[model samples]
Target chain A: DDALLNTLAILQKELKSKEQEIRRLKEVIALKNKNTERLNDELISGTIENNVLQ
Target chain B: HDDALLNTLAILQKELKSKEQEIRRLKEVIALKNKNTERLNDELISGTIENNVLQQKLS
Candidate 1:
């Protein structure tokens, strides 16, 4: 029983670590996507009028 | 000894439940990011196509 309990504890720790890593990666990707959206907004608008004129 | 073993089992069960919930939330977060990534990709493709057309006209 001691061995089984120890194994379970180890499994839980590993799982928690993986969860935290996934959360962090997701946050990074989300931030990058937001920046991309902002850039796209500018491109869609008339902000590039100088390029259009030239 | 039996009581101690039972107590340990209870604690582990609770830990397992909590871990499962965390895993579920993490999966949801990944799904959301994938959705956002797809949206951004579509926007980029549209913007690129429009920019190309405008540049061709300018030239």
Candidate 2:
């Protein structure tokens, strides 16, 4: 029983850590998505007019 | 001792499966977000190109 409990404990611990990492990644991706949306909005609205070729 | 331990073990095992499913769904959401980001990026590029062409015609 001790061994079984220990095994379960390890799984729970690992699962929690994975959840944390996923949260972080989700935040990062959300920020990226927001920035992309903003950039596209600016382009569509002509709010930003700059030549990239120069 | 054996009965109690086995019961708890079974519960955790089931919860673990549910957690895995939740994690899978979350992963799918992230993938969708990435796909959306790509689409937005493509739109931005197209807008840039259109603006450049207008600028050329004006010149």
TM-score to native of every candidate shown: 0.57, 0.71
The list of candidate 2 runs beyond 4 A from truth reads A47-54
Candidate closest to the true structure, highest lDDT: 2
**RMSD in order of candidates:** 4.5, 4.6
Q: Which candidate is the best by DockQ?
A: 2
Runs of candidate 1 with Cα error greater than 4 angstroms are: A1-54
Best prediction by TM-score: 2
Q: What would the TM-score be for candidate 2 when compared with the true structure? A: 0.71
Per-residue alpha-carbon lDDT of candidate 2 for residues B1-59, written as tens digits (9 for 90 to 100): 77887787788777777767767887787788778778777777777787788779777
Cα deviation at A44, candidate 2, in Å, is 3.9
**lDDT of model 2 at residue A48?**
50
Q: Give a tens-digit lDDT track for model 1, residues B1-59.
A: 66786676678667667866766786677677677667766766776677777878878
